[PDB]
Amino acid sequence: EIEQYSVSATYELQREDRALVDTLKFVTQAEGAKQTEATMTFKYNRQSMTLSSEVQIPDFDVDLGTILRVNDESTEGKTSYRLTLDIQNKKITEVALMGHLSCDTKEERKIKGVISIPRLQAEARSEILAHWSPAKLLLQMDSSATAYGSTVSKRVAWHYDEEKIEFEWNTGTNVDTKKMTSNFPVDLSDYPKSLHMYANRLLDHRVPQTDMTFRHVGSKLIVAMSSWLQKASGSLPYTQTLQDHLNSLKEFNLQNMGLPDFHIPENLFLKSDGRVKYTLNKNSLKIEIPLPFGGKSSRDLKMLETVRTPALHFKSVGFHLPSREFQVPTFTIPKLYQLQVPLLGVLDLSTNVYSNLYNWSASYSGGNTSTDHFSLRARYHMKA
């Protein structure tokens, strides 16, 4: 069926509509009726900065598809990109990594990140925005992560203003018991069958010269220990769930791993509230310090923008070394500096903690409410 073998590393250049794919394939098949196809192809779209990797191995059904799509959307006044990592296992997208960037150079600086897993429910967020402003400054942050129903949040926002300056923080972390139980697979594909077969083996095998099996003594011991448990104090539904578990265990057959009883509260909340309120009366001070020798571009630093190594083509020894072009991140020198000069009070803080069965509140606003009228009210409060 196979007349011979041949392995090749032929490089081709595919016509992707308008774009060109530097398709390099490494097939290792056997010539003849029996094709031992095992090809490691790694496509590259140089016209669209797209990298792909293909490996088909039907011997173990290994058909992995890795596609790296990069969108060049950066312009002279709008720097943007769309990073995409599509991890397909057996052509099934199981890990996807998408990034959205709209970091403009004028006011808006949108930085985003998408992290989710369709198979295991592992959703994570990373979104950054920073609204540029010559006078004030506006900035935000987003970083959320939910995996198996583990809700984690962090909400911190700060904004500058001539009147007031505010700064809050919110560390959200709530993990629910039933949500964990449902999201996390708590049942094994091969476990109830094993328990049933173990119970069958235990029942269908015992000492001779008699017919009682160990299940009778096991039920006796479960009854005795249940009687001892109910002998002591404590009237909770967890005890009744335990009794049901014991009755099920009497036959030596369960449904899941461990103990289904959940003594913890179904809602497990843990939050750290807090803020900063910082008054600057009504106006701020925006000093525009002149910066001499400013506004220069990359070429004025006596440095090159792109580093190009000497391409070495020596025919005597056949040495080939192309020009590796390295891009130096550009930076522009500001001509003026915006400096914010603050003012006096009023000052105020508040922070509240909400842990499980714990609601602690605090509030204090110090500082004279009026500089020119001397109305001081520095009152605090602590509640738990």
Swiss-Prot record:
It comes from the Eukaryota. Glycans are attached at residues 359, 368. A lipid is attached at residue 103 (S-palmitoyl cysteine). This is Apolipoprotein B-48. The lineage of its organism: Eukaryota, Metazoa, Chordata, Craniata, Vertebrata. The chain holds residues 1010 to 1393 of 4563 of the full protein.
